[PDB]
Nucleic acid binder design. Structure first.
Length: 287
DNA sequence: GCGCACCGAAAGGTGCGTATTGTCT
């Protein structure tokens, strides 16, 4: 799954706390030609990440985005969240398979290359505006392992910073139209790449709809047992008498956000053991 | 969104809205 969120100034605390969560390679990581250009590679330094969120690109540069209207919100970035199918999360995190985690990381990286290809900006010459395709991004990727309900949930926040290097060498805000309008497509890339990676490791796949898949030897009941957030969303539709098969975007987001109950930081080593006990109870055979 | 209107004060740049399947930070 690929979901997206335009990030504003009021999200500065949420975005920096995407780093990096000591849990269970490297949990946080830079990607992009923009990033490479700025000398940014390997692990995301969280202090440098905050500066970049604020438009402070540094190294002898003006603060970006001073042309933002007072009546509008400052955009700090674009968050692309890649979430693996539940069976994949289960093999990766309950059974413990570093190869599956790697396969997820690669699917994300390759999808983000296609997102990057679609990076754009504007330039104005004499009141006439032109859209350029820049092809470069600065991205911080932060891998995470659990859902709101403490379920195994392999996902990566790819925070695309709101900056790109234009044709003239100038750094400017990202015109996000091609990435944002291509989310459905980019999600198919993630799925296709992940599936290819898992098949390369000898897993058999079972197919859903709209391109979704799961590992063949984990079934619906077993997946459902580890999908508490899904159950909460289903109950919400039932309570509102809504039909799960035909809901608006606005009603989807309502069910999603308002069905959230607040949970509390838990012993992470004790959590795996519970996952394993649960998988045993659900009869899951991890090969 | 092709421009608009207001940011800072470059006859330049920005958010705006976009858009979002299931596993559902």
């Amino acid at each position: 799954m690929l979901s997206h969120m335009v990030l504003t100034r009021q999200d500065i605390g949420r975005a920096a706390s995407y780093y990096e969560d000591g849990a269970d390679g490297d949990a946080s990581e830079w990607q992009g030609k923009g990033a490479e250009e700025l000398g940014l590679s390997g692990e995301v330094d969280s202090k440098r990440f905050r500066e970049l969120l604020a438009g402070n690109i540094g190294e002898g540069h003006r603060i970006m985005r001073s042309a933002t209207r007072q009546d509008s919100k400052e955009r700090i970035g674009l968050d692309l969240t890649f979430s693996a199918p539940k069976s994949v999360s289960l093999q990766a995190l309950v059974a413990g398979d570093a190869e599956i985690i790697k396969a997820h990381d690669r699917a994300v990286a390759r999808t983000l290359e296609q997102a990057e290809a679609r990076a754009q900006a504007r330039q104005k010459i004499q009141g006439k505006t032109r859209i350029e395709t820049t092809g470069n991004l600065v991205i911080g990727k932060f891998r995470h392992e659990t859902s709101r309900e403490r379920d195994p949930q392999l996902h990566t926040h790819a925070v695309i910073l709101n900056m790109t290097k234009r044709s003239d060498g100038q750094w400017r805000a990202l015109k996000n139209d091609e990435i944002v309008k291509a989310t459905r497509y980019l999600g198919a890339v993630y799925n296709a790449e992940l599936a290819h990676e898992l098949q390369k490791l000898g897993y058999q796949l079972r197919y859903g709809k709209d391109g979704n898949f799961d590992l063949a030897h984990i079934d619906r009941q077993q997946i459902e047992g580890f999908s508490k957030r899904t159950e909460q969303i289903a109950e919400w539709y039932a309570a509102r008498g809504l039909d799960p098969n035909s809901v608006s975007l606005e009603q989807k987001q309502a069910a999603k956000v308002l069905s959230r109950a607040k949970k509390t930081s838990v012993d992470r080593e004790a959590l795996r053991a519970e996952w394993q006990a649960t998988a045993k109870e659900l009869g899951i055979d991890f090969s």
